[PDB]
Amino acid sequence: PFIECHIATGLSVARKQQLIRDVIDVTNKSIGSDPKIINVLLVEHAEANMSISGRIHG
Amino acid sequence: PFIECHIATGLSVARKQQLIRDVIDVTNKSIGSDPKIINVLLVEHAEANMSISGRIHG
Amino acid sequence: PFIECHIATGLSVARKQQLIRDVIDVTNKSIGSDPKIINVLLVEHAEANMSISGRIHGE
Amino acid sequence: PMISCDMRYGRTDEQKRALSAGLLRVISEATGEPRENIFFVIREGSGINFVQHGEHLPDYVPG
Amino acid sequence: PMISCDMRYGRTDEQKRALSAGLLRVISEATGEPRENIFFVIREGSGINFVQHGEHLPDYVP
Amino acid sequence: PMISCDMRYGRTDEQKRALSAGLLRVISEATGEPRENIFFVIREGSGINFVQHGEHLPDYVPGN
């Protein structure tokens, strides 16, 4: 699989590393994919540039 | 829906914020989606990193 | 086609432009697409934010 | 500019034309870019492929 | 947050439910964001559409 | 590196293989990244799903 995670800027380096590890782990466990075919991209955005459920930041 | 918009850097916060509002509204009007299931991501790029119809910037 | 390329930061602007030219060229050559229907987006990332085949950068 | 829309299967060709027309209009107004400089792609999937408020969506029903 | 997962067609609804539950939990835990503020989409395609180390994948078999 | 290509349904297996080989080569040469560190995904859809020059595309001819 290829998992792209769009998150707000601001997490520490250790937090981002652990998130990638955790994404790999839960993908492996839930659908059985060998880590060898799991690919992860973490991308950070300003909160202003993201809207979930039609919500405008601020 | 999830709408991802890749635009050139340099637009204003109000213009980007209005753009997000405009995309939510037009998705609502065109396909009838309730804003609660509309999600928008705005991503800004240097002009040199984008090519439409095989055009090379500059 | 719309081709999005996620690469590590570190290339020059000139090298990135050549990359786009070459992506357009190989797409045209491999599937016969006229450049007029080829679209390319290059996105740069820190190495730490990318994992291929479950590998963690630094390890 | 490049725009993508992931949404459930089931929209008519006419609905997709209305969506593109609207998105192109608003992107053009924001960026100053003409239609010639905008690309748009719709990506379709089943309801189970979309999760909002923690819950998977049902398959799309017109109306 | 917004999460997407591109994977081969063929996973069951039950497998997709387990995947979403897992990804939502770990993203929520990392970011401090409630599940209310997370969107997730799965995108599916044929095996030939997936290329890992230059090799095209076979179709998935559930 | 991770590469995606959104395009209409209808390209042959041979064409998809030629596309991946070419894109991998160009990316490798530009980035110094080995074959082992590159991922590529093709996302297919109907012609109506693609809009260029303000107009929706017809379906791709021929097909698979």
From TrEMBL, chains A, B:
One of its GO terms (molecular function) is isomerase activity. It comes from the Bacteria. Its EC number is 5.3.2.6. Keywords: Isomerase. Residues 1-55 form the 4-oxalocrotonate tautomerase-like domain. Signal peptide: none annotated. It catalyses: (2Z,4E)-2-hydroxyhexa-2,4-dienedioate = (3E)-2-oxohex-3-enedioate. Catalyzes the ketonization of 2-hydroxymuconate stereoselectively to yield 2-oxo-3-hexenedioate. Homohexamer. This is 2-hydroxymuconate tautomerase. It comes from Pseudomonas pavonaceae. The lineage of its organism: Bacteria, Pseudomonadati, Pseudomonadota, Gammaproteobacteria, Pseudomonadales. The chain holds residues 2 to 59 of 71 of the full protein.
Automatic annotation (TrEMBL), chain D:
Residues 1-55 form the 4-oxalocrotonate tautomerase-like domain. It comes from the Bacteria. Its EC number is 5.3.2.6. It catalyses: (2Z,4E)-2-hydroxyhexa-2,4-dienedioate = (3E)-2-oxohex-3-enedioate. One of its GO terms (molecular function) is isomerase activity. It is an enzyme of class 5 (isomerase). Catalyzes the ketonization of 2-hydroxymuconate stereoselectively to yield 2-oxo-3-hexenedioate. Homohexamer. This is 2-hydroxymuconate tautomerase. The gene is caaD1.
UniProtKB/TrEMBL annotation, chain E:
The chain holds residues 2 to 63 of 76 of the full protein. Residues 1-55 form the 4-oxalocrotonate tautomerase-like domain. Its EC number is 5.3.2.6. It catalyses: (2Z,4E)-2-hydroxyhexa-2,4-dienedioate = (3E)-2-oxohex-3-enedioate. Keywords: Isomerase. Catalyzes the ketonization of 2-hydroxymuconate stereoselectively to yield 2-oxo-3-hexenedioate. It is an enzyme of class 5 (isomerase). Homohexamer. GO terms for molecular function: isomerase activity. This is 2-hydroxymuconate tautomerase.
